[PDB]
């Protein structure tokens, strides 16, 4: 190979500035989104003195007595209890409900009983047991989530309990995205001669739109220096990254390299990975431009282990943009040459143990796409290793959403 | 406890009928979309027999004899050989080129020393050995993929390659929701007396919108026996599945639990699980109705371990709606209760030896919400576990993407 792709995505990323332009958004409308600021309580949490189950409010002093206690009234969610609560008496409440002023404990339903003049209590009472503390859980003027934080259903309930009804949220990435060869045709049409259905384009606007991008498809451009020229022109003044999902050289000499070279500062790598190796990145006028081989297997994987992580910093994300990998062993045995990292696809199941094991989806070659549907892994080989046999510990990284499950 | 989860889902899906209104859409509109029909491969893929790898073409006669056969020709790309083969040569050819006529097979150009004067073919050779025959991929008129396929960026790239533009999808999954409680206010309005922000609800939309379903959220109900009978005859008009996001009964007697029985044929369950346990079910005239109980923790895993795989099936998916469990230590003690299966929130993470353990987010209450952004996973305690100690086997599912992961 030459070049490990830790180095390529170090470049990558180093030279990248997250966005910082915002947007004021309805919680509903946050999922997937990048908090602009830190989101800080406006209030204490719990907000009051509350049940932690349903049964009685009562004080110790009543409680040891010994006698009975006659309810005096009962405090629910909705309506807490303002009554006169005189000695000798308890309040029926309800979980989550307000504990009434003055009370000194609340004691479970089970642990009374029942009787004819008032209710009786069992157990041994506590002072100040299952009374949920205001504020207890997140105080006011404290940082609940900072900026950066990717929002999800995780998120965006707890800063409605806040009474927080929107957030300030970084802007989507806008990414340009176009192809190029008078091979190629589009789904639909006739192919005549030597000619390719166009797919590297579905492939990459699909995953841009699931990973929450703004996606510009200029479509297939014509095979011409003047078409080139314009949509490159017209992409980077629209866009914060421009994707070529195949057709503009990524290292062979043409005249798209020529038209490349002109119009920004682009890198030709040649990555010591498998399947794929040529990539372009560079900065364009004001935008990055990401350039994929033009094999399918080639380029989903260069923009899946590339562009993706890019994005994520791009997008504001304090977190990686990729799933984590775990160590397991392989009930298949995998071909593989020193020289590159490969990544592999694999099919990741429970044996007998409920022991976690990978399949070879079958021919690693990237002739086909099956193994991207077959398998729901990649199998991470390391750049140096050689040829694995069943039983071998091997590095294992799930699919994410774009595959599906 | 009571009824076991198993049970419940399966009384369920039991009663659950996959939809089938279709409509026919561009495959860049069909992520997550279920086939509604068999893809069938319209052309065969490769279109004719080609070369596995660079070498050259012969015929065991030639390669019998013993001697250097001189390169007569090349196939390359798109660039195949024609004309004639003489009786005593081979022919060069390039990974992917077609194979010419009377080819036995291919060798790799890595098993032949060039001879000044012909090729000489080292290691012996197999007949067909590095010929990809046609239809080898895919065959005309061949099943691509079944109906009930989640098409996504595995998939779509596929079907258009075949020259497919569009394909018949199921209809999305209608899920009308709301909630009810003059307790309930919404975020950005002023809280009065024991009175709190509506909070399920936004959970309950966040994920619908997630899993890809049409949401007609009609707010929060008044507390009133016509404006919830309003609210139910609409919403079930309207969907195909009915949520109560919290307000409605779950079991506890009140008017919304007559309006709920005269509606439909709805059973209240009490679930062996933990958080939660009530849960509400049933048909009313047109759609399916699911009650949740209040607690935010409890609504969000009711929703996310019942209600999820429901909508899947409606959908038309033949596949499961929630992520496969995984064997793994814990490095953390946990204090579980036998008699409930116990749906606990944990951190998964590797160790040293890149070992895959899970550890507690904390308090594991239903009195926070915060378990689910502080963890990455559900660590499932059987239900007849206790307490278990660290180093010991336990059982986790990853959060899927409606949580991060």
Same mark, same amino acid.
């Given at each position: 190979?030459?070049?490990?792709?830790?180095?390529?995505?170090?470049?990558?990323?180093?030279?990248?500035?997250?966005?910082?332009?915002?947007?004021?958004?309805?919680?509903?409308?946050?999922?997937?989104?990048?908090?602009?600021?830190?989101?800080?309580?406006?209030?204490?949490?719990?907000?009051?003195?509350?049940?932690?189950?349903?049964?009685?409010? %009562? #004080?110790? *002093?009543?409680?040891?007595? $010994?006698?009975? +206690?006659?309810?005096? =009234?009962?405090?629910?969610?909705?309506?807490?209890?303002?009554?006169?609560?005189?000695?000798?008496?308890?309040?029926?409440?309800?979980?989550?409900?307000?504990?009434?002023?003055?009370?000194?404990?609340?004691?479970?339903?089970?642990?009374?009983?029942?009787?004819?003049?008032?209710?009786?209590?069992?157990?041994?009472?506590?002072?100040?047991?299952?009374?949920?503390?205001?504020?207890?859980?997140?105080?006011?003027?404290?940082?609940?989530?900072?900026?950066?934080?990717?929002?999800?259903?995780?998120?965006?309930?707890?800063?409605?309990?806040?009474?927080?009804?929107?957030?300030?949220?970084?802007?989507? %990435? #806008?990414? *340009?995205?176009?192809?190029? $060869?008078?091979? +190629?045709?589009?789904? =639909?049409?006739?192919?005549?001669?030597?000619?390719?259905?166009?797919?590297?384009?579905?492939?990459?606007?699909?995953?841009?739109?699931?990973?929450?991008?703004?996606?510009?498809?200029?479509?297939?451009?014509?095979?011409?220096?003047?078409?080139?020229?314009?949509?490159?022109?017209?992409?980077?003044?629209?866009?914060?990254?421009?994707?070529?999902?195949?057709?503009?050289?990524?290292?062979?000499?043409?005249?798209?390299?020529?038209?490349?070279?002109?119009?920004?500062?682009?890198?030709?790598?040649?990555?010591?990975?498998?399947?794929?190796?040529?990539?372009?990145?560079?900065?364009?006028?004001?935008?990055?431009?990401?350039?994929?081989?033009?094999?399918?297997?080639?380029?989903?994987?260069?923009?899946?282990?590339?562009?993706?992580?890019?994005?994520?910093?791009?997008?504001?994300?304090?977190?990686?943009?990729?799933?984590?990998?775990?160590?397991?062993?392989?009930?298949?045995?995998?071909?593989?040459?020193?020289?590159?990292?490969?990544?592999?696809?694999?099919?990741?199941?429970?044996?007998?143990?409920?022991?976690?094991?990978?399949?070879?989806?079958?021919?690693?070659?990237?002739?086909?796409?099956?193994?991207?549907?077959?398998?729901?892994?990649?199998?991470?080989?390391?750049?140096?290793?050689?040829?694995?046999?069943?039983?071998?510990?091997?590095?294992?990284?799930?699919?994410?959403?774009?595959?599906?499950?």
């Amino acid at each position: 190979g030459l070049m490990s792709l830790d180095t390529a995505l170090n470049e990558m990323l180093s030279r990248v500035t997250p966005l910082t332009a915002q947007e004021t958004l309805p919680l509903v409308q946050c999922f997937g989104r990048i908090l602009a600021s830190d989101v800080v309580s406006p209030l204490d949490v719990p907000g009051f003195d509350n049940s932690a189950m349903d049964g009685y409010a %009562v #004080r110790l *002093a009543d409680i040891a007595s $010994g006698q009975p +206690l006659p309810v005096a =009234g009962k405090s629910f969610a909705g309506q807490p209890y303002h009554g006169e609560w005189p000695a000798g008496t308890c309040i029926r409440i309800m979980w989550g409900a307000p504990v009434p002023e003055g009370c000194e404990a609340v004691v479970m339903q089970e642990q009374t009983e029942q009787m004819d003049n008032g209710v009786r209590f069992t157990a041994e009472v506590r002072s100040g047991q299952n009374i949920r503390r205001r504020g207890e859980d997140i105080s006011a003027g404290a940082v609940v989530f900072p900026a950066g934080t990717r929002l999800t259903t995780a998120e965006l309930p707890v800063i409605a309990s806040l009474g927080i009804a929107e957030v300030p949220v970084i802007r989507k %990435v #806008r990414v *340009a995205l176009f192809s190029t $060869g008078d091979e +190629l045709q589009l789904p =639909g049409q006739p192919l005549g001669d030597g000619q390719i259905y166009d797919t590297n384009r579905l492939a990459v606007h699909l995953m841009l739109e699931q990973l929450g991008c703004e996606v510009i498809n200029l479509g297939i451009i014509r095979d011409d220096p003047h078409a080139l020229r314009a949509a490159f022109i017209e992409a980077d003044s629209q866009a914060d990254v421009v994707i070529s999902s195949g057709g503009v050289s990524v290292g062979e000499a043409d005249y798209t390299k020529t038209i490349l070279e002109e119009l920004g500062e682009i890198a030709f790598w040649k990555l010591a990975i498998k399947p794929g190796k040529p990539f372009a990145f560079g900065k364009l006028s004001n935008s990055w431009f990401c350039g994929l081989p033009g094999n399918p297997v080639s380029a989903t994987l260069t923009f899946y282990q590339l562009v993706q992580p890019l994005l994520a910093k791009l997008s504001g994300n304090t977190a990686s943009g990729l799933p984590a990998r775990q160590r397991v062993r392989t009930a298949s045995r995998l071909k593989k040459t020193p020289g590159r990292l490969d990544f592999q696809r694999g099919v990741l199941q429970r044996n007998a143990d409920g022991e976690l094991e990978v399949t070879t989806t079958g021919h690693q070659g990237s002739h086909i796409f099956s193994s991207f549907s077959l398998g729901n892994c990649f199998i991470v080989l390391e750049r140096d290793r050689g040829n694995v046999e069943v039983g071998e510990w091997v590095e294992v990284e799930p699919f994410n959403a774009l595959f599906g499950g």
